[PDB]
Amino acid sequence: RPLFPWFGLDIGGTLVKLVYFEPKDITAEEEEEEVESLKSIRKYLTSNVAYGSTGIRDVHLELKDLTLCGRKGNLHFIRFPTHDMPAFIQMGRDKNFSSLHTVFCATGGGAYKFEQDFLTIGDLQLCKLDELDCLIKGILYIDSVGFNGRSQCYYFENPADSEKCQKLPFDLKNPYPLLLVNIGSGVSILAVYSKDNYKRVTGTSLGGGTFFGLCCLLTGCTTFEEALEMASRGDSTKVDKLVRDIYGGDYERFGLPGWAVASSFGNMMSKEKREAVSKEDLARATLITITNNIGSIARMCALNENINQVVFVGNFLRINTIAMRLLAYALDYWSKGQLKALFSEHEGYFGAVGALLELL
Amino acid sequence: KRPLFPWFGLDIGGTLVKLVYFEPKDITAEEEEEEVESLKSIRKYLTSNVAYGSTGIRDVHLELKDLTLCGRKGNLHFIRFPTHDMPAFIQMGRDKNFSSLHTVFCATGGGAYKFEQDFLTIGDLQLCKLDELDCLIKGILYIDSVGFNGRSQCYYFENPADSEKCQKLPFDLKNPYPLLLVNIGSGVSILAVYSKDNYKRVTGTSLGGGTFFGLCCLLTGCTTFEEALEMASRGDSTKVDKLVRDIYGGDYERFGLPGWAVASSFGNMMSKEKREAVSKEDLARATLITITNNIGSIARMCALNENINQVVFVGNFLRINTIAMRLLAYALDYWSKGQLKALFSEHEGYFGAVGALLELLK
Ligand SMILES: Nc1ncnc2c1ncn2[C@@H]1O[C@H](COP(=O)(O)OP(=O)(O)O)[C@@H](O)[C@H]1O
Ligand SMILES: Nc1ncnc2c1ncn2[C@@H]1O[C@H](COP(=O)(O)OP(=O)(O)O)[C@@H](O)[C@H]1O
Ligand SMILES: CC(C)(CO)[C@@H](O)C(=O)NCCC(=O)O
Numbered sequence: 225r226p227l228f229p230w231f232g233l234d235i236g237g238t239l240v241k242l243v244y245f246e247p248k249d250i251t252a253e254e255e256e257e258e259v260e261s262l263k264s265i266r267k268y269l270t271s272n273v274a275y276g277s278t279g280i281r282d283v284h285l286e287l288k289d290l291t292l293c294g295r296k297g298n299l300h301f302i303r304f305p306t307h308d309m310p311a312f313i314q315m316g317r318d319k320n321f322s323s324l325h326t327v328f329c330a331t332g333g334g335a336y337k338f339e340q341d342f343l344t345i346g347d348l349q350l351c352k353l354d355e356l357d358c359l360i361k362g363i364l365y366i367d368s369v370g371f372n373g374r375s376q377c378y379y380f381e382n383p384a385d386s387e388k389c390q391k392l393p394f395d396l397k398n399p400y401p402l403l404l405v406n407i408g409s410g411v412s413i414l415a416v417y418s419k420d421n422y423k424r425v426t427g428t429s430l431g432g433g434t435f436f437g438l439c440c441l442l443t444g445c446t447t448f449e450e451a452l453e454m455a456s457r458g459d460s461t462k463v464d465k466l467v468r469d470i471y472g473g474d475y476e477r478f479g480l481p482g483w484a485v486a487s488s489f490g491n492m493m494s495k496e497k498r499e500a501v502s503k504e505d506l507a508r509a510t511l512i513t514i515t516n517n518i519g520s521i522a523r524m525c526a527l528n529e530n531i532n533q534v535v536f537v538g539n540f541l542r543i544n545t546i547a548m549r550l551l552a553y554a555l556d557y558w559s560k561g562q563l564k565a566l567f568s569e570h571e572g573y574f575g576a577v578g579a580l581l582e583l584l
Numbered sequence: 585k586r587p588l589f590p591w592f593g594l595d596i597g598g599t600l601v602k603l604v605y606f607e608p609k610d611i612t613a614e615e616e617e618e619e620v621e622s623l624k625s626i627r628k629y630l631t632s633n634v635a636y637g638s639t640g641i642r643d644v645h646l647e648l649k650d651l652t653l654c655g656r657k658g659n660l661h662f663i664r665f666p667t668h669d670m671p672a673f674i675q676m677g678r679d680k681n682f683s684s685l686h687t688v689f690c691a692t693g694g695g696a697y698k699f700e701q702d703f704l705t706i707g708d709l710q711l712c713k714l715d716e717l718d719c720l721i722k723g724i725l726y727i728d729s730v731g732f733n734g735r736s737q738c739y740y741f742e743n744p745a746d747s748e749k750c751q752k753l754p755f756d757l758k759n760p761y762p763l764l765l766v767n768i769g770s771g772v773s774i775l776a777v778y779s780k781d782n783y784k785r786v787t788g789t790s791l792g793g794g795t796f797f798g799l800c801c802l803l804t805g806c807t808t809f810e811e812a813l814e815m816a817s818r819g820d821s822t823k824v825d826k827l828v829r830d831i832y833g834g835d836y837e838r839f840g841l842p843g844w845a846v847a848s849s850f851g852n853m854m855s856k857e858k859r860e861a862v863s864k865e866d867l868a869r870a871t872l873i874t875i876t877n878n879i880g881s882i883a884r885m886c887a888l889n890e891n892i893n894q895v896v897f898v899g900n901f902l903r904i905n906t907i908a909m910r911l912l913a914y915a916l917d918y919w920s921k922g923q924l925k926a927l928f929s930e931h932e933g934y935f936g937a938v939g940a941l942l943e944l945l946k
């Protein structure tokens with residue numbers, strides 16, 4: 225077995241995801257034998273919810289009483305900005321991390337980008353793993369163990385109507401084939417036919433990084449939480465041109481209802497229209513623009529590949545039920561109920577979990 | 585049999601209204617005798633001005649010269665104004681007695697529906713409402729058949745990525761079927777066209793010319809489409825976007841994404857340091873690239889799935905926009921290994937108005 229601490233790391237374009245297994249079956253004789261530095265890092269991780277200026281433990285994602293590699297313990301889910309990787313590597317140097325063990329399993333593009341820095345500054349060797357391989361392994365494992373007596377995955381029934389929208393549970397029991405849409409900084413779209421057989425069908429650079437980046441420019445927001453806050457009190461219809469702004473109603477010949485967006489941000493060439501919108505409106509418009517584009521591309525991929533279940537993951541979906549409901553409606557409405565959107569509780573961490581499972 | 589002059593086709597879109605006008609160059613003194621005074625003044629109003637009111641523009645360089653149409657010889661003009669100024673156009677309609685020219689005017693686009701009642705009450709005119717996509721098909725097929733004053737209507741870019749070798753070469757739309765037609769307006773409609781009577785709307789995207797123009801106005805303070813493109817021509821998108829390189833330190837080799845490909849459009853703009861580094865021009869360039877490559881990607885997927893190898897891109901998003909045309913041409917060529925060809929047109933934004941004109945003449 226590998227030595228503690230057991231970590232999986234996913235170094236993305238925007239966020240670094242870190243999954244840590246805290247063993248809870250340490251005997252007296254093990255505690256006796258254990259090194260001070262290991263004891264210190266373990267209590268640093270489990271007694272702090274914030275780490276430095278930017279690191280955060282998502283306490284309510286904690287999976288309790290899992291059995292991994294013959295040990296009973298808890299899974300912790302931790303993230304920080306990729307921008308703060310130099311501080312992270314410096315920490316490994318200063319905390320003597322190579323003495324606990326020299327090799328760590330890491331995925332994401334940062335596993336390649338930062339390899340030399342880890343080696344030179346930290347004296348650490350990365351076991352580099354593919355970001356989409358790790359994603360698949362992680363979602364399947366996290367699904368099979370469940371979420372402390374609740375389901376890992378779910379779907380939205382009647383996602384368009386706030387009068388009847390329900391979040392209902394769903395299992396990946398016999399899940400294949402499935403389309404997996406990974407919404408990070410960019411978007412990858414995977415057709416998955418078994419645990420071992422899958423292909424990257426397409427992607428789009430209009431991802432969560434485009435949402436967050438545009439919001440910062442358009443609204444002066446600086447955090448994702450603030451962007452979403454603004455979006456949840458905004459009205460996109462003031463910013464966008466709807467089909468009814470162009471037709472005065474539906475474009476029935478081609479089944480385009482008046483409420484559908486004809487042109488994203490399409491009113492903003494008008495000074496009068498620009499003057500009447502708020503930062504909140506611009507945030508919401510950015511949200512629906514990016515989401516509906518992804519939804520449309522996933523729909524086309526789903527129908528072409530003859531796949532009816534589409535799973536949406538990635539940290540774009542954090543605190544983003546607005547996006548999840550739009551994606552749900554987008555697939556259901558335009559496919560007349562043939563296509564189904566599925567979502568997950570640990571949306572951003574499956575890659576890091578995959579890196580941890582590889583270790584073990 | 586044919587209707588009396590004047591002959592017009594109208595396309596009232598989300599952003600622009602397009603008017604096509606056949607100027608007769610075969611008017612006899614005898615016909616003039618029979619013509620009403622409102623017709624005489626409107627004809628000279630159209631031909632002696634290249635700018636109408638506050639915002640009307642005649643695209644003089646598109647004029648089709650010495651055309652024969654329904655037994656009459658003359659020139660076809662192409663005129664545009666913002667849909668925002670429709671109230672003034674309708675009022676001008678009453679001031680210039682448009683109803684004494686004709687009771688009915690042929691109109692396509694969403695605005696043919698939206699402004700119908702206004703045109704009747706204020707303007708004294710009935711609109712003959714016609715389908716925007718049908719008129720688009722009839723217009724491009726007609727305009728291609730006549731050609732552009734000796735030149736071809738449609739064309740492609742050979743070697744679009746390299747300014748050393750980039751060439752605009754003619755493309756004959758004789759036996760063109762099947763083709764994908766990508767109409768880039770405020771929004772985008774994507775058609776698979778199997779014949780002149782047989783086509784379907786495959787899909788579309790709301791991320792269109794209106795998204796490019798709207799975002800550019802918000803992000804840069806530009807007020808015109810021309811300014812937006814001028815700004816984009818002097819910008820560097822790689823300060824704005826996050827490349828595959830920025831994430832991987834090179835290519836993502838497993839799935840063949842080269843280091844230089846965009847991973848996340850506007851992805852650097854979460855960083856305050858990066859935001860302070862960029863200019864208005866960089867943002868305009870990033871906006872142009874993001875909207876264009878997204879349309880290209882979507883069109884590529886439609887073309888491949890429908891087994892269509894020819895994609896004609898139209899709409900006023902592409903007006904004075906050789907940069908976006910070259911990006912579309914490159915992206916389709918590169919990401920399909922030379923299997924898909926991008927085609928473009930000289931009268932990009934006026935095909936629907938032409939269709940409305942042809943409907944008028946039977
Ligand atoms: N606290 C946060 N900081 C930055 N981005 C966040 C945050 N919360 C959610 N996001 C969203 O998550 C996206 C990155 O998602 P992720 O799945 O981690 O992909 P990547 O591998 O590109 O980092 C961002 O583009 C943003 O939209
Ligand atoms: N002078 C202009 N004014 C406004 N938009 C322009 C102009 N020139 C080009 N455009 C572009 O053309 C688009 C409108 O395209 P068009 O094909 O006329 O569609 P629509 O029918 O939606 O008006 C705008 O969104 C903008 O991108
Ligand atoms: C480069 C990755 C794979 C990094 O996760 C992702 O950001 C992405 O797939 N971006 C855009 C993909 C595309 O243009 O198809």
Ligand SMILES: CC(C)(CO)[C@@H](O)C(=O)NCCC(=O)O
Nearest residue numbers: 485486771772773787788789790
């Ligand atoms: C509504 C029209 C047809 C009007 O030109 C056009 O703007 C459009 O096709 N918009 C995109 C709608 C969509 O496909 O989602």
Ligand SMILES: [Cl-]
Nearest residue numbers: 589590591627
């Ligand atoms: Cl006339």
